[PDB]
Amino acid sequence: GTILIDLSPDDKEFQSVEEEMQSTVREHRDGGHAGGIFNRYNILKIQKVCNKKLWERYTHRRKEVSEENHNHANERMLFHGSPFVNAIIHKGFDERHAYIGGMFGAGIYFAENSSKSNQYVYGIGGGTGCPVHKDRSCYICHRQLLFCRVTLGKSFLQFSAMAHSPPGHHSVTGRPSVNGLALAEYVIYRGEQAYPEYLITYQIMRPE
Ligand SMILES: CC(C)CC(=O)Nc1ccc(-c2nc3ccccc3c(=O)[nH]2)cc1
Ligand SMILES: [Zn+2]
């Protein structure tokens, strides 16, 4: 039931999604090993993901969470990178999309930094890089990220350098405690708590 609608680059909505992508790139402690070496992207396409069943699944869960948290869903727009973004946009998020070995347990992980999500496009740790050239820093191959609407509800704060949410919480927030420039990462434990709103197709750009 999924339709993808291309946004025009002239559309304010294209522009605001692109700005969130570009503005949340940071350097990574791996020197670019997982995600590649870059400071910015070449955005090739931004598509709106339209699926009525999946949207209704999300909004149902959002109301459940809101009612458990003083009418506050604590909804964010966050990035998600995975080799399975094509499955997600058709079928939704579920346990097959969980990072079993994540530092906050087996859940579905999202990032404020688009470049953090970029590290997972080709698998955990970047896998073996792009399928065509086996290059984690490939500047040629098209990559895709999701920019997702995520319900955090009451989030458990973890200060740090499918399972269940911590009791009394709907998510976990991984707060950076060493790298002063890193943004937060978030984990949900129910696929219904995220909707894959935008599919972004892009390349990383080689620094000059
Ligand atoms: C079959 C197996 C490989 C499933 C899996 O672990 N997939 C997986 C998908 C996405 C991510 C992921 N992990 C993150 C961790 C922190 C911040 C963002 C992300 C993010 O955008 N994606 C990790 C693992
Ligand atoms: Zn490549």
Characterization of the model:
- This protein has helices at residues 12-23, 52-67, 85-91, 114-118; strands at residues 3-6, 41-50, 75-80, 108-111, 143-151, 155-160, 171-176, 185-188, 194-204.
- It is of the alpha+beta class and 208 residues long.
- The protein has a single domain, classed as Phosphoenolpyruvate Carboxykinase, domain 3 (Alpha-Beta Complex).
- The strands form two sheets. A five-stranded antiparallel β-sheet has the order 1-2-9-5-3, sandwiched between helices. A four-stranded mixed β-sheet has the order 4-8-7-6.
- The chain is globular and about 50 Å long.
- Ligand JQF is lined by residues 79-82, 97, 99-100, 109-111, 116-117, 120, 123-124, 185.
- Residues 8-208 form the PARP catalytic domain.
> Count of DSSP E strands?
9
Question: End-to-end span in angstroms?
Answer: 43 Å
CATH architecture assignment name: Alpha-Beta Complex
Taken from the alpha-carbon principal axes, the silhouette is globular
Number of helices: 4
**CATH topology group:** Phosphoenolpyruvate Carboxykinase, domain 3
Bound molecules: the ligand CC(C)CC(=O)Nc1ccc(-c2nc3ccccc3c(=O)[nH]2)cc1, zinc ion
Strand content: 25-35%
- SSE order, as H and E? EHEHEHEHEEEEE
Helix share of residues? 10-25%
Number of domains: 1
Strand order of the largest sheet: 1-2-9-5-3
Q: What is the level 1 CATH name?
A: Alpha Beta
Quaternary state of this entry equals: monomer
Rg over CA atoms, rounded to whole Å, is: 16 Å
The largest β sheet comes out as:
5 strands, antiparallel
